[PDB]
XYZ file of N, CA, C and O in Angstrom:
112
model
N 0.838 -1.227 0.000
C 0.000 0.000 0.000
C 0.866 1.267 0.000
O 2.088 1.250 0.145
N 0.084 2.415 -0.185
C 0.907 3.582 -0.580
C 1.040 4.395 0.855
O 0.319 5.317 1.237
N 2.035 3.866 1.465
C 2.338 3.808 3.444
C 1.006 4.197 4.467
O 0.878 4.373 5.678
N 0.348 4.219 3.610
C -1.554 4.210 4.341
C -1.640 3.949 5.832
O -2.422 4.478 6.621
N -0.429 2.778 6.159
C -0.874 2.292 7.332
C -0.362 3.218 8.882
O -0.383 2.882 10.066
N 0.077 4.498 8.183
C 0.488 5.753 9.383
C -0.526 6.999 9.234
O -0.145 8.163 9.356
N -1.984 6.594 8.931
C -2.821 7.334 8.220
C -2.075 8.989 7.144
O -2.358 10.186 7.103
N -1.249 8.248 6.585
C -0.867 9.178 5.497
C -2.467 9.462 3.872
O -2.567 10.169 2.868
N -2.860 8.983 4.191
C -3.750 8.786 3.097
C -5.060 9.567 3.645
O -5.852 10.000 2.808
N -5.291 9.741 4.901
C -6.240 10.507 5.498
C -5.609 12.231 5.506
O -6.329 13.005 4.876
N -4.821 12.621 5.915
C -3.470 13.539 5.865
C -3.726 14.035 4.416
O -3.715 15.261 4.304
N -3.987 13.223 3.133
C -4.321 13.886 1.897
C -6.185 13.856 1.969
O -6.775 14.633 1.218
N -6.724 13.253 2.574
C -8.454 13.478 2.337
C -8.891 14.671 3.126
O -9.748 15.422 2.661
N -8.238 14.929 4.535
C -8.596 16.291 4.664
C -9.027 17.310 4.369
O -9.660 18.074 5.097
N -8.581 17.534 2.648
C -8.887 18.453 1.949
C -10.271 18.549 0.751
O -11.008 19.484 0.439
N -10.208 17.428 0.393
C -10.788 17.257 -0.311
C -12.820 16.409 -0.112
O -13.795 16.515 -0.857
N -12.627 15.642 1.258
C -13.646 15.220 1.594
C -14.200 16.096 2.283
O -15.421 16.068 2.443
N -13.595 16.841 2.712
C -14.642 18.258 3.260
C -14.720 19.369 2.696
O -14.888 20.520 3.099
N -14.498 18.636 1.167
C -14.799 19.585 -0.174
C -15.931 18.989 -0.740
O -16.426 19.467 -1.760
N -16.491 17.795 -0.082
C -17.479 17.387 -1.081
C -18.718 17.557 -0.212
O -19.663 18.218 -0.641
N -18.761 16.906 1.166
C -19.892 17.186 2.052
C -20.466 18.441 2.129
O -21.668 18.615 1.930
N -19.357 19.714 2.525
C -20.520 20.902 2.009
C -20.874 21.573 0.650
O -21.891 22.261 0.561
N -19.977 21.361 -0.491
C -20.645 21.088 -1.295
C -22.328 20.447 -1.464
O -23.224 21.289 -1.529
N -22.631 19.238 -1.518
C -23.774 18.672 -1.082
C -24.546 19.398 -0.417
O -25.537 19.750 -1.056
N -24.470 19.851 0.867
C -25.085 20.510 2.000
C -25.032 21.923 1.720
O -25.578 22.717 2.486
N -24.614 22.182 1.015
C -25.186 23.805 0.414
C -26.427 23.815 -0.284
O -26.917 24.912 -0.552
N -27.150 22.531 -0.700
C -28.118 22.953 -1.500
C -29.338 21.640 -1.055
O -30.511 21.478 -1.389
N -28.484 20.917 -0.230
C -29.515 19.408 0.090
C -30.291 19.381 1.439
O -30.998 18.414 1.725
């Protein structure tokens, strides 16, 4: 795996998954 297992892979979603929820929730 791409060293995932030191939550490096969360460390990059930070940005972007709480780019999509309010997205959504601006209009739902």
């Amino acid at each position: 795996f791409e060293d995932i297992l030191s939550g490096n892979l969360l460390q990059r979603m930070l940005r972007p998954l709480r780019s999509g929820l309010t997205q959504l929730l601006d209009f739902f």
